[PDB]
Symmetry: D2
Subunit: 436 residues, 4 copies
């Protein structure tokens, strides 16, 4: 039928857990959760009877509600909360006519919708963070295992100097760990929305005493944070979600394009657990989320006490950012857990420039006996000459009169070995891993 | 259930016709249409039997296929076409085992998916264009009716000089008409995708003769345009859809913010057919589509013969651009057909600056008798003085010695009438409407 | 001449201090600062003579260098550091031929360019943060002064319920204070770049001991933070700058569109220190920075050990984000310091809906005597009837039999007074201001 | 000094001709050109003396004006035209006091600024189009020369089937030719801006007769197109520039990433005229322009008769899009003219998958003797087995009993030759080149 979203156009998240958390029914449920938490908190502060709150809570179930009718009725007010409230009120009235007068008491559409949005975000970010933690575990393992696995460092698409795959993986780990930390902190900071019609909370009511009691109760009932001010037009939580999800998707995209560079036919230094489809999916989300994030970020420009459109522009892209990033994280776990590292092919590929990739380290080694300027000039000359003649760097070095007898044979064998010129990659990996 | 997309987060398109054209099932159907058209065209050029094409065509129905299984299986290849092909092949094999060997003959995932994407786009743009035409009809009617309806022209949020609502509406008409023309031409130019594994069409086969015959047949079977080259990495149709849909959404967004400016409480010069929810919905799409369009446009950077991610990043945002823009167009029709213009309130609001809004036209009128520089200086002085004293511009003018007896009384009454200083707005509306 | 950038196209920053911090000459100077700090730190750890570091430091002045030649020579390597290094080396060699062999010792283009970029960012963010602090001071003053200044709360462009300008200004304050805090923390966290050719630091050299000593020395010489890992392809600082500057520009944009809504001709509740040009300029930056930020954020996808283009795409938009946001902040200070609040016009505008804006608070007041449902129904009926008849809400209320003798006259006079139905706006302002 | 823009942060355009066309002084000159054209056209239609127009034209030179003062004074009105007009008026008054009364007669800031913007765009697009034409010439030459140069087609980063470099280059040609055509048509369609204070042209004046005469004269004096309506808030030309420049930058970005894929160390099939810096620069612009374009496109949402910020947000990004795209085009010419194609290395790389890259073409060849299903199964089996055993595809084929004596030896030698399985790449190149 025409109502099914199966993820047909978005394989990066199709079949992944985040789908179930951010589908339309889950958002309907989140808005019902926000209503019932509102009633319960109002009862806890004395504004209505506890039994009416229990009845509303019991009726506040997505299966009591006609999802399609609510969605299709929203065009009349440009949001779904008026229809939702009517449906919940009828559902409560069926079982408890006294309780129905307290459904949505003193409230406004945006408190319920935004509170539900932060509930959905909070649950979805719990999943994204747990997946980022698993990915980080597999990456830290790859980093420790390959601390001493040499490979060609590549800059501007060409071999530069040798590095280690452990160092590369530790950069991956650094990105994923940063993302998981930001996801956790953002999750702990998402607030409820309790402002009333235009942010004065007039319908919900020393004014300071009652404000404090109600705000504490609604924090307790929702599990969300208490904000200093109603934020109907202070869209900091939405901008923060946009920033954190675009950072996360971009970091995973970094891992994805590195994997694709290593996995291509004529490199073949890693393989995915034979197209590299996992990195293709991660990359697909990486090319989508930042553009959605900029629309989210632009909605900070929200006029008056409720914008005539900029708030409405937030819901779908936010959901999609949660969905895509969720898929990408799940896919990243599969990638980092399953990556196949071909150390021997990395070692072989180190020889592709016929010694030129160690010329910097040879220049350094010759600096005590030649000077820095003379050694650098001699080595760039030898690298060019070896490139033209299709000979090894060491071959051209063994023909320059200036180098005759300059170093013992064994030291030359050590110097021209690409696997030994990795700088301090080992110490850097140790330092990154001690942070865990 | 968790699979329902009801438009709960996107009221601008919930319940509108475009939904049915661009849902997941409609895309599945479009890919089946592309397969069956491929078989039929191959039969028309002699590469397989006509009966096998009829059998495949008959089986190529979305209700023969498990949508959810195809979507969930796509993670193995990062696209849904391999699973789709297996399901269609089984469905054909049930009724006709000989025909099943010709399902997806010589083809590749991207020919089918991209061809289906252009089928979906073509049908969705048929709807968007027809709606833009209806909106343009209502706007041209508003433009003709209010050719002589005076109102305050507003620049940088303040009254500037008088204009007419007919001229404003004719600008609306100009934008919508431009969009409808671009939608129609783009629709007539969307091509099929027939490239094979890496753009050589090797599996489908003077090579020029067979190429021409097959390309003509596939054009006939699909109704899509024949491209000069396979475009698996030449993403011009996608960039063009992105450009046209973002232009359309932005134009409708212009109408929406104008309506909101006119409809606010302390202006009240128009009303929607009492929050202005239609313009809120149009604006909501206007704040979403250009950001999706930039991701689409960036996918022009598609490496090799098939990108490992940038092509995959296109499907969902493209669908969403079609969906949102579709909603916005439908909503725009409702807005332009139902707008309530309060001419009397426009006339009253013209007097809000106490004559200052005609000071430019008074300066012009005094230029024969004072000079341009002296008249401009005198009128800015009088506008300031009238602003401070809370008096009419004409009051301050009737106290300057330099103006004593400068113009007859009746000419002053004509000059200070805001409804008569509209420039050539009437001629401009006539010129815009003669274009129809 | 053709080399002048005077801000002709960007008045929001033309003539503001940030220009001088982020112009081309300032970036040249920052890269020279990064070179000289590198030499000094290498001398402090024992790798070269202290006198050579003093000579390089003395020569490392933008006026010793041909800016235009460096910029125009950069096309050969796609960055300006090779030309810069040659020019600094010649300049040192003129005065001290021994010191010139240590210019750019063991270094790479990206360490110098990225370190200079973080120096520029750090200085520019010092200015942005100080300006945001001044703006926050003026906003907190407006919030305290107008805690009890009543005005129409506006939602979806229409009067909703009354609020106070103090509450509005306190939301402005909340945004600016959040931005200033994030700017300060980001500034304290920007790191230097010290990676070498491909992130192993091979040219700069227990390996852990020497790493730690050099990293500490370079932190001391630059004043920048020490990162856990070389970040040539771990673009977290750039993404963080993008996020913080787009948040800042959007927050200021919120203030700007609120000011424009209040300042328009038929509202006139505030005036800028007579077009509202300051808010126009702030808004102009708000519509630019988030789009630049998304390109910055997308550069997290940086392949290999140095991207062939994505790193190069960062410099100009980053500079522009610093520049625009800087202008916007400076302009925001001028706006918040100079805003003219017309309390009497706010009070008058409260009466524009002829009492309908207090109907919610009347419904609440009648709930003890009528019930919630009956009171809400009665008041929406009376609001409609009063709208049609062009009469006051209280007029229609005084004609319904159901309300006869329901409340004493004085209580009705209090109830229909828009200035008294502000909810708990006062307590909310007190709570926001106690945070200072 | 602090005013120099040398392109230090943007090597893709530093030292290229477009800089001189779009610098601040060039925009000042364009606005002076728009003023003088306005005076001349007004004289041609009879509204002022021809001699006053000649005097204004003679004084309307950027070297008569203080650029820095105009730019810095613009903060008072949020645009530079009031200061420009004062400076031009003084300059005319020095030589001709009578002519100075006709400077900026009946005009408004936006007519002059937007007309100058379209003058700058028109000249810059002349350059961009000529460069795109040169690039297209070199690409068509590469396409003809390498029509028969075989190479590995690569999809999702792996060898797929063989293609030709001629076909690849012909796709490059198709993109560049499309861009050059769109640039030329857009250039021929850019209009002047002549609206007056709020789009009625009241200050400039059968009203239809005078409108037509003045509009024709201003078209003649500017060389720009005559629009149907004043477009102060109908931002179609700006959106069109945004679309065309982002398309152009993305197309060139496609060529750039293809070059980088071919040029990397372990592929080495092409080389740039030894880092690939030209493609790095093109790519750098490709990652910048679409994000700037989305801000431009969003400015279609321009409220009232002149937006309080959205028009102001256009100037700098538009200039930058012109600048970057200009650089990219110039760089693309250098790249396409200088590319070094290593056909022998392409042929060698075809053998990297040990025959697996022809397995599809072997399957086709066996279909008459085995069936399609059986041949495909046999070849995927043989490809896997050959992959595991590190043997050639033909080796594993020569061991299956089912293939014994199936084809003569010579036919096997032809079949397993990667250079002969290119599909109809030759015919496709012929067809693309016949379009010239």
């Amino acid at each position: 039928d025409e109502l099914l979203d199966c993820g047909l156009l978005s394989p990066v998240r199709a079949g992944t857990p985040v789908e179930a958390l951010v589908c339309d029914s889950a958002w309907l449920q989140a808005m019902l959760d926000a209503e019932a938490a509102l009633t319960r908190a109002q009862a806890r502060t004395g504004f209505l009877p506890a039994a009416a709150a229990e009845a509303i809570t019991a009726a506040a179930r997505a299966d009591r509600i006609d999802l399609l009718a609510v969605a299709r009725g929203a065009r009349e007010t440009a949001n779904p909360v008026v229809g939702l409230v009517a449906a919940l009120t009828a559902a409560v009235r069926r079982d408890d006519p006294a309780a129905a007068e307290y459904v949505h008491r003193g409230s406004t559409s945006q408190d319920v919708l935004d509170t539900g949005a932060m509930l959905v975000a909070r649950r979805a970010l719990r999943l994204i963070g747990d997946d980022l933690d698993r990915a980080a575990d597999a990456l830290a393992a790859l980093a420790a295992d390959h601390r001493d696995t040499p490979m060609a460092g590549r800059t501007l698409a060409l071999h530069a100097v040798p590095t280690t795959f452990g160092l590369k993986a530790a950069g991956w780990l650094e990105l994923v760990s940063e993302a998981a930390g930001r996801v956790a902190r953002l999750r702990d900071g998402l607030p409820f929305s309790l402002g009333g019609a235009a942010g004065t909370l007039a319908g919900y009511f020393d004014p300071a005493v009652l404000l404090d009691r109600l705000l504490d109760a609604y924090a307790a009932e929702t599990g969300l944070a208490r904000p200093v001010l109603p934020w109907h037009v202070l869209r900091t939580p939405v901008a923060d979600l946009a920033a954190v999800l675009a950072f996360t998707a971009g970091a995973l995209g970094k891992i994805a394009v590195d994997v694709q560079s290593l996995a291509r036919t004529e490199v073949a230094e890693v393989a995915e657990p034979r197209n590299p489809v996992l990195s293709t999916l991660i990359r697909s989300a990486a090319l989508q989320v930042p553009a959605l994030a900029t629309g989210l970020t632009q909605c900070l420009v929200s006029e008056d006490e409720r914008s005539a459109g900029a708030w409405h522009a937030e819901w779908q892209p936010l959901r999609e950012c949660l969905r895509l990033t969720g898929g990408a994280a799940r896919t990243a776990v599969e990638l980092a857990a399953g990556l196949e590292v071909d150390a021997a092919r990395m070692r072989a590929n180190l020889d592709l420039t016929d010694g030129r990739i160690v010329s910097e380290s040879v220049a350094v080694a010759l600096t005590p006996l030649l000077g820095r300027q003379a050694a650098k000039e001699l080595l760039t000359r030898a690298a060019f000459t070896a490139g033209h003649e299709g000979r090894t760097l060491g071959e051209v070095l063994g023909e320059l009169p200036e180098l005759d007898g300059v170093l013992p044979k064994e030291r030359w064998e050590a110097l021209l070995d690409p696997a030994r010129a990795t700088g301090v990659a080992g110490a850097l990996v140790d330092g990154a891993l001690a942070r865990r």
